[PDB]
C-alpha cells in the first residue's frame, strides 16, 4: 500500500523502484492582459523520475509546445506524465524495469495505472511522505537544461553525484531530501549556504559541490538550522 515512515527502508533494498513527481510538469506565469483580464503563459516543465537507490534521475523535459491547443491543462499534465513514464519503462530492458513506481501526489495514481495496464506486475503506490521534489528546479543545472530546451528531450543525471562511493543510499537520500527541503523553504538562504566558500566547486559532471565528508556535516547542520528557523519565522517560535 502507501509508502510512509514505517516502511521507509524499502526504498533502499534491491527491488528496482522509481519515484515520480509531476509537480513541475505544467508550469505557468500568470499575468494581466491589455484589457485587464488575467492569462497564463506556459514555460517548459519536467517530469522528475528518480531511482532512490542508485540516484539515477530520468528528467523528461516537457516543452511548452505540448500544451498548444489543449484544454484542461492541469488534468492533461497528469496523463502526459503517465504517458511519458510508461514510455520510459517500455524503453528499458526488462531487467531494468521497476517493480514499483511511487507517485508523490495521489492524483497520479489513476493516470499511471491506466497507462501501465500492460505491466500488471508493476505496483503503482502512493506515499504519505511530504517529499520536497518540487524543489528540483532550484538545482541550477536542472533548471538550465529545462529552460533551454527547444523540443521534448530526456536528460539523464545522477542526483547523488559520486556520494555513493562514500555513503549508503539511505544516507544519500537523506542528504538529498534535506538539501531539497532547504531549497524549498528558503531558496536564497539554501543557495547561499551551498556556495559561500568559493574554494569548493561543482564539478562539470556534478550537480552539487565537492564537499569533503567533514564539510558535508557542516553543510547538513546549516541546512537543518535554516529549516527550523524558517519554521520559526513562519510560525513565530
Amino acid at each position: 500500500g502507501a509508502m510512509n515512515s514505517s516502511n521507509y527502508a524499502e526504498l533502499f533494498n534491491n527491488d528496482i523502484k522509481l519515484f515520480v513527481d509531476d509537480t513541475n510538469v505544467y508550469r505557468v506565469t500568470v499575468h494581466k492582459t491589455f484589457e485587464g483580464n488575467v492569462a497564463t503563459k506556459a514555460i517548459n516543465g519536467c517530469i522528475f523520475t528518480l531511482n532512490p537507490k542508485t540516484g539515477h534521475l530520468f528528467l523528461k523535459i516537457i516543452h511548452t509546445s505540448v500544451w498548444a491547443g489543449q484544454k484542461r491543462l492541469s488534468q492533461l499534465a497528469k496523463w502526459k506524465t503517465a504517458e511519458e513514464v510508461s514510455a520510459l519503462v517500455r524503453s528499458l530492458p526488462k531487467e531494468e524495469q521497476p517493480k514499483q513506481i511511487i507517485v508523490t501526489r495521489k492524483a497520479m495514481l489513476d493516470p499511471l495505472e491506466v497507462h501501465m495496464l500492460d505491466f500488471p506486475n508493476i505496483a503503482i503506490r502512493p506515499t504519505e511522505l511530504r517529499l520536497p521534489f518540487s524543489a528540483a528546479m532550484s538545482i541550477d543545472k536542472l533548471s538550465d537544461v529545462v529552460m533551454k530546451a527547444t523540443e521534448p528531450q530526456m536528460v539523464l543525471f545522477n542526483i547523488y553525484d559520486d556520494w555513493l562511493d562514500r555513503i549508503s543510499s539511505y544516507t544519500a537520500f537523506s542528504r538529498l531530501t534535506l538539501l531539497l527541503r532547504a531549497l524549498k523553504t528558503n531558496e536564497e538562504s539554501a543557495k547561499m549556504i551551498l556556495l559561500s566558500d568559493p574554494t569548493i566547486t561543482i564539478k562539470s559532471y556534478h550537480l552539487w559541490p565537492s564537499f569533503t565528508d567533514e564539510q558535508w556535516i557542516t553543510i547538513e547542520s546549516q541546512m537543518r538550522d535554516l529549516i527550523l528557523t524558517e519554521y520559526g519565522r513562519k510560525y513565530n517560535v
Binding site: 492533461l76 496523463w79 503517465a82 504517458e83 489513476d110 493516470p111 495505472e113 491506466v114 495496464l117
Partner: protein, 300 residues
C-alpha cells in the same frame, strides 16, 4: 393467470412473490399462490422465521412449464420443482383452489410496478447468468458470488454477470488512455452494447436483473453490478437519446420500489452523486434525480 402450488408449509417462513410478501406459520394450511400474471418473469422467495440468514428464491416464467414448491427436510429449504404431468398438475391446482388454500397475487389494476421493474428481464436471458441447465427456473440467494468477485470460489454456484472494469484493457484503447478513461463511450457503445450485450434491451435487462437480486436477496455482488452498469452509462458522453430516456424510467421505478430502510446499504453514495451531479448525464435523469432528492436527500 397461472399458479404455483405448495405441497405444504412445514416451517414458519416469510414468502415473497415479486414485490409482495406475507407470513406463513409453521404447519399452516398453505398450498400456494394463484392469479400470477402471465407475460412477465416472476420471483418467489423465502426467509425462514428462525434464521433470517439466507434469503433465497427462484426466478421463473409460467409459460415455460408447470412449477411448484415442496419443502425438503434434508436440505432444509423450500425447493422449486417442475411437474411434467400436465393433467396431474391441473388436478392438484384445481383441488387447492376449490379448497381456497391459495393466496391471491394482489396486483392492483392501475399498477405497472412489476412490468416497469422487469421490462427487459427474460427467463432464457437470466439462465446465461445463473447456470443450471437441467431446470427451467433459476435459484439465487444472498450469499452467491459473481464471476468478477471470484477473480479478486465454487463456479457452479456463481452469478455470471457480465464483468465491467473501468481500469482494464477491454475498457481502455491503447493510445486513448485518457480519452477512454474520462469518457467511457467507446467501452459502452462498441465493447459492451455492440460487441457483448448485442443491443440496449440486453444491457437494460441484466441491469434490471442485478437490481432485483440486490433488493430481494441482499446480494452484494448484484448491487455492485447494478451500480457498475449505471456508472458506465452516466460516464459516457455519447449515449443514444432513447437509452437515456429509458434509463431514467428504469431507475425511477427502482428507487421508487426500494424499501426506505435499506437505502443505507443498497445505494452507493459515490456512484449516485457522481451520476446525478458530476457525470456527462447529470442533466439527463430528471425523474430519477427528482425522486432521489425527495426520498433520499441525505445520501446526497
Amino acid at each position: 393467470m397461472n399458479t404455483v402450488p405448495f405441497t405444504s408449509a412445514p416451517i414458519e417462513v416469510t414468502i415473497g412473490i415479486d414485490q409482495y410478501s406475507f407470513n406463513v406459520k409453521e404447519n399452516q394450511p398453505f398450498h400456494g399462490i394463484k392469479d400470477i400474471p402471465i407475460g412477465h418473469v416472476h420471483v418467489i422467495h423465502f426467509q425462514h422465521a428462525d434464521n433470517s440468514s439466507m434469503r433465497y428464491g427462484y426466478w421463473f416464467d409460467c409459460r415455460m412449464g408447470n412449477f411448484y414448491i415442496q419443502y425438503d427436510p434434508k436440505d432444509g429449504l423450500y425447493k422449486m420443482m417442475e411437474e411434467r404431468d400436465g393433467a396431474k398438475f391441473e388436478n392438484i391446482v384445481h383441488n387447492f383452489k376449490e379448497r381456497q388454500m391459495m393466496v391471491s397475487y394482489p396486483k392492483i389494476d392501475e399498477d405497472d410496478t412489476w412490468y416497469n421493474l422487469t421490462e427487459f428481464v427474460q427467463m432464457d436471458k437470466i439462465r446465461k447468468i445463473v447456470r443450471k441447465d437441467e431446470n427451467q427456473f433459476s435459484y439465487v440467494d444472498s450469499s452467491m458470488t459473481t464471476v468478477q468477485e471470484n477473480e479478486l470460489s465454487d463456479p457452479a454456484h456463481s452469478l455470471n454477470y457480465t464483468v465491467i472494469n473501468f481500469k482494464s484493457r477491454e475498457a481502455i484503447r491503447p493510445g486513448h488512455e485518457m480519452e477512454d478513461f474520462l469518457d467511457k463511450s467507446y467501452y459502452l457503445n462498441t465493447v459492451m452494447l455492440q460487441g457483448i450485450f448485442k443491443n440496449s434491451s440486453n444491457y437494460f435487462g441484466e441491469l434490471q436483473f442485478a437490481f432485483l437480486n440486490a433488493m430481494f436477496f441482499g446480494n452484494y455482488g448484484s448491487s455492485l453490478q447494478w451500480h457498475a452498469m449505471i456508472e458506465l452509462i452516466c460516464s459516457s458522453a455519447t449515449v443514444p437519446k432513447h437509452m437515456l430516456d429509458k434509463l431514467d424510467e428504469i431507475l425511477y421505478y427502482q428507487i421508487k420500489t426500494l424499501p426506505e430502510q435499506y437505502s443505507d446499504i443498497l445505494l452507493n453514495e459515490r456512484v449516485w452523486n457522481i451520476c446525478l451531479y458530476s457525470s456527462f448525464q447529470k442533466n439527463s435523469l430528471h425523474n430519477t434525480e427528482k425522486i432521489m432528492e425527495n426520498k433520499y436527500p441525505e445520501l446526497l
